[PDB]
């Protein structure tokens, strides 16, 4: 009779699981302690379409901490062990951030960054990109609000 709603519900449950799908705290603590802001947070507003691209673009430096003044970090580095084996620090304005320069050749669902004449980086578009968290959580809200509306119509 009417399996359109039942099929649409399943579609909403599908995407919701994918977005909220799993899946760092230490970097957050380090950020405020450095008086800086996570690059991921600066990039939390990027759309669902561009999030994978930007996340791939930046490579490992996607986990970077952005501070307006690098000298804020120096004093803390000595003896610092409570952190990932690689810690990225970029000087810039967390309110008006200038992107890094990238020599990039964009493929489908991946990018090829030329780090130097003798070094390349292949970064494929990830499921669950680091960037675009804010837009991702919003989309999940819309889906929830839509799923309930479908449930009454079910």
């Amino acid at each position: 009779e009417r399996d359109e709603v039942g099929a649409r519900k399943n579609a909403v449950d599908e995407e919701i699981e994918r977005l909220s799908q799993p899946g760092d705290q230490r970097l957050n603590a380090l950020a405020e302690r450095f008086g800086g802001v996570l690059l991921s947070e600066i990039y939390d507003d990027v759309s669902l379409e561009d999030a994978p691209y930007f996340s791939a673009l930046y490579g490992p430096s996607r986990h970077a901490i952005v501070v307006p003044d690098l000298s804020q970090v120096t004093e803390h580095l000595e003896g610092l062990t409570d952190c990932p084996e690689d810690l990225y620090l970029i000087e810039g304005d967390p309110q008006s951030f200038d992107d890094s320069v990238f020599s990039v050749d964009e493929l489908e669902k991946a990018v090829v960054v030329k780090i130097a004449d003798r070094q390349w980086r292949y970064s494929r578009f990830p499921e669950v990109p680091l960037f675009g968290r804010a837009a991702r959580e919003s989309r999940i809200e819309s889906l929830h609000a839509e799923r309930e509306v479908l449930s009454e119509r079910f």
Partner: protein, 245 residues
């Protein structure tokens, strides 16, 4: 004599002497406030473009001084029901201008084309369903490039000379936006510029900045009326800085 014509939010106008006037700080009637201002000469006609795309011309001399509350434009103009004046212009009669709607249609014309003495004005630009008039752009150099940015984040650049010159009408499409989408506010002309070809743009999007050098702008150059090129993270632009040598 140099004058500054001031338009209030409720459609009241006045002519202030000189160009050193602090319009927002002027004296407006209760509930009213600054909307727009334009600087020109007393011999120059002031042009008004309403929200429906009609243009009107008034001689500044016939306007009241900025010493008073001014007067309602309705005294001299008859606008369509529910329409408001959103744009004012004072340029040389030969001044080339870029008219456009947010549906992505537009045409190049001359200031003289907007000059309509009659109180009902003239139908300058025709608006598609739910479309709005773009801020008219003054073309400083006939060799400048036209730059268009859509809400979807697509950009297209081409010599402003490629855009057909008209005296009125809907015009031709500047950048290709699906008529159906435009009429639903799903996409549309977000930004429209005319600038030198060796220009550098700094676009502010939230807490990010996208810097487009002349080299990047080159990659987005193409034929008038095309899609054209989709940009990464270029939606919901907050501010645009233009550097033009």
């Amino acid at each position: 004599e140099p004058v500054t014509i001031v338009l209030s939010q409720m459609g009241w106008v006045r002519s202030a002497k000189g160009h050193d006037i602090d319009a927002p700080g002027l004296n407006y009637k209760a509930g009213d406030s600054f909307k727009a201002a334009v600087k020109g000469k007393s011999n120059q006609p002031v042009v008004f473009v309403d929200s429906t795309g009609r243009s009107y011309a008034i001689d500044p001399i016939t306007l009241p001084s900025a010493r008073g509350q001014g007067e309602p434009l309705t005294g001299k103009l008859t606008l369509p029901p529910g329409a408001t004046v959103d744009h004012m212009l004072m340029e040389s009669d030969d001044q080339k201008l870029l008219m456009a709607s947010d549906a992505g249609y537009g045409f190049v014309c001359t200031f003289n084309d907007l000059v309509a003495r009659n109180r009902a004005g003239k139908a300058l630009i025709t608006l598609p369903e739910n479309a709005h008039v773009m801020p008219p752009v003054v073309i400083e150099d006939a060799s400048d490039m036209l730059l268009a940015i859509t809400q979807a984040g697509r950009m297209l650049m081409f010599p402003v000379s490629d855009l057909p010159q008209l005296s009125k009408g809907k015009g031709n499409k500047i950048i290709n936006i699906p008529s159906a989408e435009a009429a639903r506010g799903e996409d549309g002309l977000a930004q429209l510029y005319v600038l030198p070809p060796q220009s550098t743009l700094t676009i502010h999007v939230g807490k990010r900045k996208i810097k487009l050098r002349p080299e990047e702008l080159q990659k987005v150059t193409g034929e008038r009326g095309r899609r054209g090129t989709l940009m990464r993270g270029l939606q919901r632009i907050d501010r645009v800085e233009i550097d033009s040598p």
